[PDB]
Each structure stands twice: as structure tokens, then as C-alpha cells.
Design a protein around this ligand. Structure first.
Ligand code: CL
Ligand code: CL
Ligand code: NI
Ligand code: NI
Ligand code: ZN
Ligand code: ZN
Lengths: 340, 340
């Protein structure tokens, strides 16, 4: 099931959509997770918010400017912090003549332009904004309260991790980028594009993640020297042309307003925004993730970084192996194809 | 005198060198200041310091990484702050295989390389380090105590301005850059290259500064919109090929270890380091500067920036015009050619 590991798109009915957990399992039962990434277009009956008319006053505390250096499809992205601005201010710049989306025909033409011009004209990205655009009445696919077993991190340790077990908003503009990475603790993510122009994504099947890690280490050995998980710094950009060249399998998908994307444990993704827009994301967990989390290779090289204790998930959901794992003796092998 | 406004080099004897003020006047009497920049190679009898063997332990608190974006000779340079390192650490990186000076023949070949590669491989620059490498016994050309009338800023207002009336050290490496600018308040500067590889400079005659300002505003109108003195942000790099093209006259000069450079009021300069090195600089003033300082166009757009009060210099050195200037009625025109 999903032999080719292509990115699947799903159209749940309202009835299916009302159960989050079951639907994630369903799409895994269809092999969605093999591609690393899937699209879910929600039922038309559903709406996260009445309208987006009342948010120009919303404050993006820490926009960042994306400076990118490199050539022939390899690049590194440095984030310069800029001062507080409002969505109103952000929108004016995004729509301004210097920063706005070029004219184009097919997405293939806009994609060529992103890669020929990513080093020029650094854009602002209103990233990592704490908050949510969902009205409180909304019970389905509400990113602020999915009620997955990730909630055990908070319930048992009083711990908050911004953007991991709380929601983040991302205001974008043409050519703002997200670099190749997997999620914190190789968790799942969910991303909803509330409005505006598209966000294109690239994904590599989890069963080929190690081959992308290997290639990255080749091209950036110094970065590989000082961190094992350097891709987790989210600074590394690699062209699809580079990926074909070193035979890394990958797929591409464009997300439009009103659509969800789900990323799956150890699914490497990257991409960029087409123009002004607003996405909302968080991380979540399932019982299948637990193994991935026990085995996730973390960033050593910074003290900021996200470490979740696996003790509570193994204690409850893998009792048969708890003592074994506790003693360094749990040698489970992950099969990335299983829908477990 | 100096019709062509070329960068002059001077070889003072020890006897001439012992009087700083007089020697600056002498070189101005030869028209050195018309080029904006002059070299002074000091008498061999003189040495700022016995040796530079005891400074690996010296701490550079705020190295910065120089990210540069642009193309066909126009660029903007953003400074990412990195963590504390020692000269020892700095030296290892500077000398490392990824960061070190390419092999080359003539400087013309190394200059081509700086401009073809300035956007790649961002280097660290151990800039703006408070301190001095001069032994205390040294009375000539001692950057920490030139005793110019700039000392009135401190004596009358208790004011310290790091790198302006105190010394700064600059540890460099291949391809670290200083962008087109004039000094704070269009003051004079002095730069001494204590050791290591060269530092190349570009200069534009003060009598053609407005033409470079004009060209800059053309190429960066947005930056020109929000600041009048945007070049003062020290972010703007412009190729010599661009300067020929728009007919801005300029000259180039390479400074080697043990040599001083002097910049003159309203002399636009820029350049770069050839490899690992260490320069020391500060600003100074003469009576000729006072007019330039009364008329200097400042950065509006940041509250950090350097504003020196001219009151005390006009009061003492232009008493005939004090009341007039006080009342908005002093309409002196600067002649950049005069040695005044
Ligand atoms: Cl590297
Ligand atoms: Cl501009
Ligand atoms: Ni992510
Ligand atoms: Ni300067
Ligand atoms: Zn790391
Ligand atoms: Zn300014």
C-alpha cells in the first residue's frame, strides 16, 4: 500500500473528519505516511473562523529576515531578527513592488524563479508567532486542542514548548523558505493554511531519510562535525535538482488556502511561500511515533533545543519493554512502512 | 597641489613623526586630503609594541558574520552576531582551509576573487573590539592618546564614544569587508595595521562625495527613503567596476603590516582584508574639520547613532561666527581643496 511513496491527498467527509485520531490512522492505513507528507482537504461544511478581517492589528513580535548564501542548488539560511510589526505592516511590505510575487504561468516557472533568486532580495517572514486563528467553538481539527498523546508531556511535567505542544502562526511572503528538516523528536506535524497564496512543499520518504542525512553531511561536513543533527538547525536548503542528481527520492506538493498538510515521523520536508499568507501549525503524537521518539537523534550543539522525556510513553504504551528500555537493552527496529 | 586627487604615501622621519598635529597639517599642505585617504609609513625607529606573542588569550566579545547579498557589483551586508571567541580561536578559523586566502599572483587577481566571491562563504570579523595594542611608553602616533581637539568632547561632557574617542581593534580574515562610508560626524580617522596580511582600501575624493551619495540613492531608493544618511549604516558595497561605469572617481590602495592610513573629513572609503590580521583605529579632529562637522548629514533612522555637539568647537575656534551659527544664519561653504 502506497508502493511508490507518493504524496497522497484526502477528502474526508464531515463524519470522518469529526474523529481526528481515527482519520490519521485511516490515512496511515492507506500508506500516506510512506511519502512523509499528506494533504487533507477538509469538508466544505467546516470553517476554522468566520472571517480574517479583524487581524491587521495582530502583532508579529519577531519577524526575521532570511539571508541565504550559496550556489548551484546548495544553500544556508541565516535569520536576522527585525523589530515588532503588525500584520498590516507585514502585508504592505509583502504586497510592495520589491517583495511581491513575480508574474508567472505554471508553478514549474515560479519554482525555477525561487531557486534562481533565493539569495537575492532577502524577505521578511513573520514566523513563530504564538497564537491561533481558530474560533473557540470549533471541535474538529483544532490545532490548539487535538487531544493526542502529546498532551502527556504537559499533564505530567507542567512543560510548555512553544510551537510543539502549542500553536504557532506563520505570516509569509514571496520566497520565504523553510529548510530541510524533520520535526522535533521526529513527531508528527499539522499545518493549516488559513488564507493567502500557496505554500509549496518537498518531501523525502522516511525510508530514505538516512540517505538525505548522508548527502547533507557530504555537502556540509563542518556543520556535520559540530552537530550530528545539524539539519535540525533548519538552515540548510537543497534544490530538487540536487536531489535527482544524488538519487534521493522526493515528491513535491502545493498547499492552497483552506488545506491541511500532515507530516509524519521522520519525514524530511522543506519548501516556500508563493506570496502573502498565513499558516498555523503544531506538533502531535500517536502511539506509532513512540518508537521514533525513543530513537530520535537530537541536536547536541545548542542548549535551547527540544528534548522530550520518553519515560511516560514507554511506561504506559510499551509496558512489556519498559524495564528493558530503561536498561539500555531495547533494540526495536523501526519499519517505516508499517501503519502500526 | 594634488590636482589629480590620487592617494599619496608619506615617509616621515622620526623628527617629523614626533609631532602628530604638524604632520597631519604637512600632508594636507601637500594636498593628501584631496584623495580622501593617505598612507603614512612610519619611521623604522618606531614600534607600537615589542611583539604580538602574548595575545592569543585576548577575547573578541562580539565577532560578527558577514552575510552579503546581491549581484553585478551591488551588495548589502548584514552582520550576524556570534559568540565570544579568542584570537587563538579566531586565528584557527581564519587559517582553516575553508576560510583562508586563496592562492594568487597579483593583487588584481585577488581583487577579482573578492568580488566574484563575496556572497559565498560568509566570514567572521572580530570587529569593534574595545582596546589597544600600544605599549604605554609610546608617545608618537599613539591611537589611544593623539591629543587632538576631539578631546574636548570628553573634557566638556564626560562622554565616551567607543571607537570614536577611544580605540577599537579589528581582527580580520580573508574577504571580511568594510562598506562605503564616511566617518562619524565626517571626522578624520586613523588606522594602524599591527600585523598579518594586508587590508585593501577604496576612496572617493571628498569633492566627489555627493556624486557617490547620488549614485547610492539611485541603486537603493528604499534605503534612501527611510534614512537620508543610509550609507552610514555601513551595509552598502559597490564594486569599482560600478564606480567606473557611473563615472565616480576613486582610487585604490593596499595597506600592509606596520603602515598607517589616514581618512579625511568626508572621504568615502571601503575595502577588505586579504587574510588574518589586526588593525587598530580611532577618530580624530582638526580645526579644518569643524566646518564639516557643523554640516554633516546624520542618520535619522536609529537612536543608537553618534551625534557630537559642535557648540564647543564653534565657541572657541570660530568665535567671530558663534552667534551667527547659533541663530541659523551661518552659511559657510566648504571648499574641500583648501588645506585650511
Ligand atoms: Cl561545512
Ligand atoms: Cl532599496
Ligand atoms: Ni516542520
Ligand atoms: Ni571608517
Ligand atoms: Zn546542533
Ligand atoms: Zn539611518
Amino acid at each position: 500500500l502506497n508502493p511508490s511513496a507518493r504524496i497522497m491527498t484526502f477528502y474526508p467527509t464531515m463524519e470522518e473528519f469529526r474523529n481526528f485520531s481515527r482519520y490519521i490512522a485511516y490515512i496511515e492505513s492507506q500508506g500516506a505516511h510512506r511519502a512523509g507528507l499528506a494533504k487533507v482537504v477538509p469538508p466544505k461544511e467546516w470553517k476554522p473562523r468566520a472571517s480574517y478581517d479583524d487581524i491587521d492589528d495582530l502583532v508579529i513580535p519577531a519577524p526575521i529576515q532570511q539571508l541565504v548564501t550559496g550556489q548551484s542548488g546548495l544553500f544556508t539560511q541565516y535569520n536576522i531578527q527585525k523589530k515588532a510589526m503588525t500584520v498590516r505592516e507585514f502585508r504592505k511590505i509583502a504586497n510592495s513592488d520589491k517583495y511581491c510575487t513575480p508574474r508567472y504561468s505554471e508553478f514549474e516557472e515560479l519554482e525555477r524563479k525561487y531557486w534562481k533568486n533565493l539569495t537575492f532580495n532577502p524577505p521578511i517572514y513573520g514566523a513563530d508567532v504564538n497564537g491561533t486563528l481558530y474560533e473557540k467553538h470549533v471541535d474538529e481539527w483544532n490545532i490548539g486542542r487535538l487531544r493526542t498523546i502529546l498532551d502527556l508531556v504537559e499533564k505530567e511535567s507542567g512543560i510548555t514548548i512553544e510551537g510543539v505542544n502549542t500553536p504557532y502562526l506563520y505570516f509569509g511572503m514571496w520566497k520565504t523558505s523553510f529548510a530541510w528538516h524533520t520535526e522535533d523528536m521526529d513527531l508528527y506535524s499539522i499545518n493549516y493554511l488559513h488564507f493567502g497564496e500557496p505554500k509549496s512543499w518537498y518531501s523525502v520518504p522516511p525510508e530514505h531519510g538516512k540517505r538525505l542525512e548522508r548527502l547533507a553531511k557530504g555537502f556540509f561536513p563542518g556543520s556535520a562535525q559540530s552537530c550530528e543533527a545539524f539539519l535540525r538547525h533548519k538552515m540548510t536548503l537543497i534544490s530538487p535538482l540536487m536531489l535527482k542528481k544524488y538519487g534521493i527520492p522526493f515528491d513535491k506538493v502545493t498547499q492552497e488556502a483552506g488545506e491541511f498538510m500532515i507530516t509524519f515521523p521522520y519525514g524530511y520536508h522543506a519548501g516556500f511561500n508563493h506570496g502573502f499568507n498565513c499558516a498555523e501549525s503544531t506538533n502531535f503524537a500517536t502511539r506509532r511515533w513512540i518508537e521514533y521518539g525513543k530513537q530520535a537523534v537530537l541536536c547536541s550543539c545548542r542548549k535551547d533545543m527540544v528534548k522530550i522525556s520518553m519515560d511516560v510513553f514507554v511506561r504506559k504504551f510499551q509496558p512489556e519493554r519498559y524495564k528493558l528500555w530503561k536498561a539500555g537493552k531495547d533494540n526495536t527496529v523501526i519499519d517505516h512502512t508499517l501503519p502500526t
